[PDB]
Every structure is written in C-alpha cells, then in structure tokens.
Amino acid sequence: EPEITLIIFGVMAGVIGTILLISYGIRRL
Amino acid sequence: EPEITLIIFGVMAGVIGTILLISYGIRRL
C-alpha cells in the first residue's frame, strides 16, 4: 500500500504550513 | 486505522521537528 506517499505529503504539508504560518506573522513585525 | 496513521505521525514529526529546530536556534541565536 501507498505509505511513503502519505508520509511525504504529510510531513510536507505540516512543515511547510508551520514555517509559512510563522514566517507570515513575522513578515508583519 | 491505516493512512490516517501515517498522516498524523507524518505531519506531527514535521511540524514538531520544524518548530523545535527553529525555536531551538532562536533560543540561543
């Protein structure tokens, strides 16, 4: 079954979403 | 509960690892 796929899209969505959200609030101040 | 397991552990490992790494470096420049 597709495992590596879920792991990749998962960690990617989280890591990216995290850095983005944080880096976003910092762009304002 | 397949799939959801990889997604949870995945995003969790990434999000946590990301915030940790960053929060770590910023904790002491």
Cα A5 from Cα B17, distance rounded (Å): 19
Whether residues A7 and B6 touch (CB distance < 8 A) is answered with: yes
- Start-to-end Cα distance in chain B: 41
Phi/psi zone of residue B3: left (φ > 0), alpha (ψ -120 to 50 degrees), beta? left
CB atoms within 10 A of CB A6: 20
State the maximum Cα–Cα separation within chain B, in Å, rounded to a whole number: 41
CB A14 within 8 Å of CB B14: yes
If you measure CA to CA, which chain A residue comes closest to B2?
A3
Q: Kindly report the length of chain A.
A: 29
